Write a protein that binds this ligand. Structure first.
Ligand SMILES: CCCCCCCC/C=C\CCCCCCCC(=O)OC[C@H](O)CO
Ligand SMILES: CCCCCCCC/C=C\CCCCCCCC(=O)OC[C@H](O)CO
Ligand SMILES: CCCCCCCC/C=C\CCCCCCCC(=O)OC[C@H](O)CO
Ligand SMILES: *C\C=C(C)/C=C/C=C(C)/C=C/C1=C(C)CCCC1(C)C
Ligand SMILES: CCCCCCCC/C=C\CCCCCCCC(=O)O
Ligand SMILES: CCCCCCCC/C=C\CCCCCCCC(=O)O
Ligand SMILES: CCCCCCCC/C=C\CCCCCCCC(=O)O
Ligand SMILES: CCCCCCCC/C=C\CCCCCCCC(=O)O
Ligand SMILES: CCCCCCCC/C=C\CCCCCCCC(=O)O
Ligand SMILES: CCCCCCCC/C=C\CCCCCCCC(=O)O
Length: 264
C-alpha cells in the first residue's frame, strides 16, 4: 500500500514534513478535546437522544486513534538526510483513513437518523441502505486509490463508481431530512437543514483530496491533500457532531427533560 500512494514518491523539505506532522497531531488533540466535551454533555441529553452523543465519542476516538497512528507512521517512515526527509521504510499509507471512514461513517449517519426521530422498522431499514451505499462508496474508493500512482485511469473509473454510491446516499439522506423535519422540536426543523448542507460541503472535500494525484502530483499535492483531509475531518466529524449534539439537547429540552432545560 505504501508504494501505491504518491506520498512515497517524493522527498520533503523540513517545512513540508513538519507541517504535515503538525496537521495530524493537531487533529489528534482536537478530536480528543471534543471527545471530553461529548462525554460531559451526555448527561444533559434525554435518554431518547443520548445514543447520538455517544456515537460522537466513538467517532472522536476512532478518528483520533487513526490520526495518531498516521502521525507516528509518518515519523517512522522518513529520516532527515542531506537536507531533506527521505523515505526509510514502507510504514505509511492513506488506506488507514479509508478504515477510519468504514467505521465512522455508519456512526455519523446513525446519529443523524436518531435526532430525526426515526424509529423501529424505518430506522433499521434506512440505516441499512445508507450503510451499504456508504460502504460501497468507501470500498470502491479504496480500490481506486491503490492505483493513484500506477493507473490514473483506474483511479478515475473507480472514483466514478464511488461517486454513484455517494449521490444515491445523499439523495436518501436529503429525502429523509425533508420529509421528517416537521417532527423536530424546539425549532430544530430549521437547524437540521443547515446540518444537511454542512454535510454536503464537508463530505465533498474528500473526493477533491482523492483527485490530488491526478492534477497535483508533487510534494505540495501531498501537503494540500492532508490539509483538505484535515478541514474535511474537522467539519464532517467535530462540527457536525457539535450540531447534532445541539439538536439533541434542544429537542430534549422541548420534550420536558430538565437537565437539558437547565443546561440551556
Ligand atoms: C447502484 C444504486 C442503486 C441502489 C438502489 C437503492 C434503493 C434502496 C433505497 O434507496 O431505499 C432508500 C429508502 O428511501 C429508505 O426506505
Ligand atoms: C459521475 C457519475 C454521475 C454524476 C452525476 C451527479 C448528478 C448530480 C445530481 C445531484 C447531486 C446529488 C445530491 C442529492 C442532493 C439531495 C437530493 C434530495 O435531497 O432530494 C430532495 C427531495 O426530493 C425532497 O423531498
Ligand atoms: C481544541 C478545542 C476544539 C474542539 C471543540 C471544543 C469543545 C466545545 C467548543 C464549542 C462548543 C459549541 C458548540 C456546542 C453547542 C451546544 C452545546 C451545549 O448546549 O452545551 C450545554 C452546556 O454547555 C452544558 O453546560
Ligand atoms: C469522516 C467522515 C466522512 C463522512 C468521510 C467521508 C468520505 C467520503 C464522502 C468519500 C468519498 C469519495 C468519493 C465520493 C469518490 C472518491 C472516493 C472517496 C471515498 C474519497
Ligand atoms: C484531552 C486533552 C488533549 C488530549 C491530547 C493529548 C496528546 C495528543 C498528542 C498525541 C501525540 C502524537 C505524537 C506522535 C508523534 O509525532 O510521534
Ligand atoms: C483541554 C480540556 C481541559 C478542560 C478542563 C479539565 C477539567 C476536566 C474536564 C471537565 C470537568 C468535568 C465536567 C463535568 C461537567 C459538569 C457536570 C455538572 O455540572 O454536574
Ligand atoms: C448493517 C446493519 C445496520 C443496522 C443498524 C441499526 C440500528 C443500530 C442501533 C440503533 C440505535 C437505537 C437508538 C434508540 C433510539 O431510537 O432512541
Ligand atoms: C466488512 C467489509 C465488507 C462489506 C461487505 C458488504 C458491502 C460491500 C458493498 C459493495 C462492494 C463492492 C466491491 C467491488 C468489487 C471489487 C473489489 C475487488 O476487486 O476485490
Ligand atoms: C459493485 C459495484 C460496482 C463495481 C463495478 C466497477 C468495476 C470497474 C473496475 C475496472 C477496472 O479498474 O479494471
Ligand atoms: C471522482 C469523480 C470521477 C471523475 C470523472 C472523470 C471521468 C473520466 C474522464 C476522462 C478519462 C480520461 C482518461 C485518460 C487519462 C489516463 C492517462 C493519463 O492520465 O495520462
Amino acid at each position: 500500500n505504501s508504494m501505491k500512494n504518491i506520498e512515497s514518491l517524493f522527498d520533503y523539505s523540513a517545512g513540508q514534513f513538519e507541517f504535515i506532522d503538525h496537521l495530524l497531531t493537531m487533529g489528534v488533540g482536537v478530536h480528543f478535546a471534543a471527545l471530553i466535551f461529548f462525554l460531559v454533555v451526555s448527561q444533559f441529553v434525554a435518554p431518547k437522544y443520548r445514543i447520538a452523543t455517544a456515537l460522537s465519542c466513538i467517532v472522536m476516538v476512532s478518528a483520533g486513534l487513526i490520526l495518531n497512528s498516521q502521525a507516528v507512521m509518518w515519523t517512522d517512515a522518513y529520516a532527515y538526510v542531506d537536507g531533506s526527509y527521505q523515505l526509510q521504510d514502507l510504514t505509511f499509507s492513506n488506506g488507514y483513513r479509508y478504515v477510519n471512514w468504514m467505521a465512522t461513517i455508519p456512526c455519523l449517519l446513525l446519529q443523524l437518523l436518531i435526532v430525526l426521530n426515526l424509529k423501529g422498522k424505518e430506522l433499521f431499514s434506512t440505516a441499512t441502505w445508507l450503510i451499504l451505499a456508504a460502504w460501497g462508496m468507501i470500498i470502491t474508493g479504496y480500490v481506486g486509490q491503490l492505483y493513484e500512482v500506477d493507473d490514473i485511469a483506474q483511479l478515475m473509473i473507480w472514483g466514478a463508481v464511488s461517486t454513484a454510491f455517494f449521490v444515491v446516499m445523499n439523495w436518501i439522506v436529503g429525502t429523509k431530512i425533508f420529509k421528517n423535519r416537521a417532527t423536530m422540536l424546539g425549532g430544530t426543523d430549521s437547524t437540521i437543514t443547515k446540518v444537511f448542507w454542512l454535510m454536503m460541503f464537508a463530505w465533498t472535500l474528500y473526493p477533491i483530496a482523492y483527485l490530488v494525484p491526478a492534477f497535483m502530483n508533487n510534494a505540495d499535492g501531498v501537503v494540500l491533500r492532508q490539509l483538505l483531509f484535515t478541514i474535511a475531518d474537522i467539519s464532517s466529524k467535530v462540527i457536525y457532531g457539535l450540531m447534532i449534539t445541539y439538536i439533541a439537547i434542544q429537542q430534549s429540552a422541548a420534550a420536558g427533560y430538565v437537565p437539558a432545560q437547565q443546561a440551556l
